[PDB]
């Protein structure tokens, strides 16, 4: 190769992302140990679906089966986004209202577009809807200009009559971002149903953005993960089930945030996104449109 590995950037779930050098540029190389072949094959099949060339989805370069028995590593080469992920960005920066609006609209744009069935993409073919299945601020990367890029499709599932998937399990996502349906183990293998599970998680990602924005007044608090403040960064299926399902709670929307006309309307939108009733949640496309028209306020 002229592929030259440089440094570890992210420790992913089933794989590990290296900054790497290719030709005169950088590329991200995710390395799967050989027991995670089926995450590498899942993830490469998603990237290989028609119409996945899109400004707000991570871009695919190559998948390499580096060898034969017991030596085999599985490499997946995508574009490298130096600015990194949204969660670490939020960890170290407080963002402007224009930046929030831009990351919110491009992030819902890339999600609505993942979610979208496109009868035909020229030279390529049918793009079915795709549910992410692990949507979170770790999995939203950021361009130089803060444009959102969705990443990490190792759990994504296509809704394509006739091309079925492999083993698809019920509770596969990061626990903190799990819709109550999911926590309770109750999930129809239907497109609308999975989409709405993604939308509950984008709701919490929106919250995270709002929580580190300069909100024309009060001080801005240090970044926390959804529910890190209520239970832990981690604690289990059982505590989330209390706080999220039984007691009905969500990350606090601060009173003083409501005195900004933009943030007031974005929080209304968040609350519809993370509604207990799955059927009451907005689609990604309706969030993209909302965000656009709030910017315009
Ligand atoms: N985790 C990551 N951080 C930065 N750039 C990436 N490009 C692909 N994955 C990436």
Swiss-Prot record:
Main location per the UniProt record: membrane
An example Gene Ontology CC term for this record: receptor complex
Keywords of this entry: ATP-binding, Cell membrane, Disease variant, Disulfide bond, Glycoprotein, Heterotaxy, Kinase, Magnesium, Manganese, Membrane, Metal-binding, Nucleotide-binding, Phosphoprotein, Receptor, Serine/threonine-protein kinase, Signal, Transferase, Transmembrane, Transmembrane helix
Membrane topology label: Single-pass type I membrane protein
Catalytic activity, reaction form: L-threonyl-[receptor-protein] + ATP = O-phospho-L-threonyl-[receptor-protein] + ADP + H(+); L-seryl-[receptor-protein] + ATP = O-phospho-L-seryl-[receptor-protein] + ADP + H(+)
GO biological processes: activin receptor signaling pathway; anterior/posterior pattern specification; artery development; blood vessel remodeling; BMP signaling pathway; cell surface receptor protein serine/threonine kinase signaling pathway; cellular response to growth factor stimulus; determination of left/right symmetry
Residues annotated as binding ATP: 9-17, 30
Modification note: Phosphorylated. Constitutive phosphorylation is in part catalyzed by its own kinase activity.
Active site (catalytic residues): 134 (proton acceptor)
Residue span, Protein kinase domain: 3-293
Cofactor: Mg(2+); Mn(2+)
Record topology, Cytoplasmic segments: 3-297
Record's subcellular location: Cell membrane
GO molecular function, one term: activin binding
EC number, as in UniProt: 2.7.11.30
Role this protein plays: Transmembrane serine/threonine kinase activin type-2 receptor forming an activin receptor complex with activin type-1 serine/threonine kinase receptors (ACVR1, ACVR1B or ACVR1c). Transduces the activin signal from the cell surface to the cytoplasm and is thus regulating many physiological and pathological processes including neuronal differentiation and neuronal survival, hair follicle development and cycling, FSH production by the pituitary gland, wound healing, extracellular matrix production, immunosuppression and carcinogenesis.
Similarity remark: Belongs to the protein kinase superfamily. TKL Ser/Thr protein kinase family. TGFB receptor subfamily.
Disease: Heterotaxy, visceral, 4, autosomal: A form of visceral heterotaxy, a complex disorder due to disruption of the normal left-right asymmetry of the thoracoabdominal organs. Visceral heterotaxy or situs ambiguus results in randomization of the placement of visceral organs, including the heart, lungs, liver, spleen, and stomach. The organs are oriented randomly with respect to the left-right axis and with respect to one another. It can be associated with a variety of congenital defects including cardiac malformations.
Subunit field text: Forms an activin receptor complex with activin type II receptors such as ACVR1B. Interacts with VPS39. Interacts with DYNLT1. Interacts with BMP3. Interacts with BMP2. Interacts with BMP6.
Protein name: Activin receptor type-2B
Organism: Homo sapiens (Human)
Included range, full protein: 190 to 484 of 512
């Amino acid at each position: 190769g002229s592929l030259q590995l440089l440094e570890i950037k992210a420790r992913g779930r089933f794989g590990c992302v290296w900054k790497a050098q290719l030709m005169n540029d950088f590329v991200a190389v995710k390395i799967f140990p050989l027991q995670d072949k089926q995450s590498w094959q899942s993830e490469r099949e998603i990237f290989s679906t028609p119409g996945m060339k899109h400004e707000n989805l991570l871009q695919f370069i190559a998948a390499e089966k580096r060898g034969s028995n017991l030596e085999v590593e599985l490499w997946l080469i995508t574009a490298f986004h130096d600015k990194g992920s949204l969660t670490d960005y939020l960890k170290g920066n407080i963002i402007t209202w224009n930046e929030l609006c831009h990351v919110a609209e491009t992030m819902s744009r890339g999600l609505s577009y993942l979610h979208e069935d496109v009868p035909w993409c020229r030279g390529e073919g049918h793009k079915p809807s795709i549910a992410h299945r692990d949507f979170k601020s770790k999995n939203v990367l950021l361009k130089s200009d803060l444009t959102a890029v969705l990443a990490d499709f190792g759990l994504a599932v296509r809704f394509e009559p006739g091309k079925p998937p492999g083993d698809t399990h019920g509770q596969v996502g990061t626990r903190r971002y799990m819709a109550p349906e999911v926590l309770e183990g109750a999930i129809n293998f239907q497109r609308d149903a999975f989409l709405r599970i993604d939308m509950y998680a984008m709701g919490l990602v929106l919250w995270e953005l709002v929580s580190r924005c300069k909100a024309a007044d009060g001080p801005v608090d240090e970044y926390m993960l959804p529910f890190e403040e209520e239970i832990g960064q981690h604690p289990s299926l059982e505590e989330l089930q209390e706080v999220v399902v039984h007691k009905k709670m969500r990350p606090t929307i601060k009173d003083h945030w409501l005195k900004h006309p933009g943030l007031a309307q974005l929080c209304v939108t968040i609350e519809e996104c993370w509604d207990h009733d799955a059927e009451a949640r907005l689609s990604a496309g309706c969030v993209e449109e909302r965000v656009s028209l709030i910017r315009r306020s």
